[PDB]
């Protein structure tokens, strides 16, 4: 079994660079929060 | 650690839960196109990936059990609980349907004519074919029982024989019921009477088909010497599900076919 172990190896995303993570994390929760807004926009832009 | 000292099973990664999850999407959104943007392509793809997934998932399950020797005592005791539990959840599913029925028949709206069965509905005769189907399923219950006893007594020929008789009575019920569906003078669209009769008997009908193919699978695993006199859970589970399937029919029979008509 080639499964790495320990802090930062038991997660599906890289935790090596604090800044690349800041980006990944930001897109992740970011997109989550924005989606509802764009859905509402979508509905509003229809007829 | 490394060499495990517990009698439990650590299953190797399988891509089946993902394809199976994906299959649920395909079929559900597939049913949506059909119901609405009138089309069955997606649903066809869904039903396919689904059959493919189930075939391979149980295939592995047999591989791991019959060939690889992974089903220790501790392992099977847990498959019992799982099946037992799974059947209970089915028993609660049919409960919604019986509930709906008793709700509708116990207090008929004036729209029905303030009576049950509603005016215009012509119920089938419980004494005709509904009795035949009752006797058929019951007989399979005794023959499946003869099958399980032959198995635990190492009698290959007879297990295979009682299992065959069982499987055929089960198919005989499917056909018999299919024709009643055709000959029957009411439909899913005839208000509550039809609604209530066709989905309960219908979901049950889908269960006899699901239960029969299960038995058919057991039939083949047996020709292939898969089961030993003492290790044959696939058959124990098959028999449990089959008995569940009679009992639901015994309840539909007394409620919907007799009392409710």
């Amino acid at each position: 079994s080639h499964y790495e172990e320990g802090p930062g190896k038991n997660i599906p995303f890289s935790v090596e660079n604090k800044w690349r993570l800041l980006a990944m994390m930001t897109l992740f929760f970011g997109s989550g929060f924005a989606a509802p807004f764009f859905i509402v926009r979508h509905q509003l832009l229809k007829k | 650690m490394t060499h495990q000292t517990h009698a439990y099973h650590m299953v190797n990664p399988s891509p089946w839960p993902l394809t199976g999850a994906l299959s649920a999407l395909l079929m559900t959104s597939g049913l949506t196109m059909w119901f609405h943007f009138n089309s069955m392509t997606l649903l066809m793809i869904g039903l396919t990936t689904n059959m493919l997934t189930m075939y391979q998932w149980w295939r592995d399950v047999i591989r791991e059990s019959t060939f690889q020797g992974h089903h220790t005592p501790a392992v099977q005791k847990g498959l019992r609980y799982g099946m037992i539990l799974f059947i209970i959840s089915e028993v609660l599913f049919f409960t919604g349907f019986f509930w709906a029925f008793y709700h509708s028949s116990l207090a008929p709206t004036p729209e029905l004519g303030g009576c049950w069965p509603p005016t215009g509905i012509h119920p089938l005769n419980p004494l005709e074919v509904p009795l035949l189907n009752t006797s058929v399923l019951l007989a399979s219950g005794v023959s499946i029982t003869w099958a399980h006893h032959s198995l635990m007594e190492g009698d290959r020929k007879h297990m295979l024989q009682a299992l065959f008789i069982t499987i055929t009575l089960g198919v005989y019920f499917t056909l018999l019921q299919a024709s009643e569906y055709y000959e029957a003078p009411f439909t899913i669209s005839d208000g509550v009477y039809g609604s209530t009769f066709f989905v309960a008997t219908g979901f049950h009908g889908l269960h006899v088909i699901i239960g029969s193919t299960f038995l058919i699978v057991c039939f083949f695993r047996q020709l292939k010497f898969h089961f030993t006199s003492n290790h044959h859970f696939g058959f124990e589970a098959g028999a449990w599900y089959w008995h569940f399937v009679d009992v639901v029919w015994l309840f539909l029979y007394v409620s919907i076919y007799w009392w409710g008509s």
């Binding site: - | 190797n12 793809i45 391979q56 591989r63 690889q68 020709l223």
Partner: protein
């Protein structure tokens, strides 16, 4: 009838480092690759649909 289960056992117990769903042979792989493909494509198709059906 047969009873060549023992043969099947030896085969699946063979330490070839393969995972059980591939341990069986070449067809296991074609089946695998087929199933995986229809699922993905299907997913894409439905994505296309649920979107084409998202507008008036």
């Amino acid at each position: 009838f047969e009873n060549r289960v023992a043969e099947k056992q030896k085969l699946f117990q063979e330490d070839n480092g393969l995972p059980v769903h591939l341990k069986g042979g070449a067809t296991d792989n074609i089946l695998y690759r087929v199933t995986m493909t229809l699922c993905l494509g299907g997913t894409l198709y439905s994505l296309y649909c649920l979107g084409w059906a998202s507008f008036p």
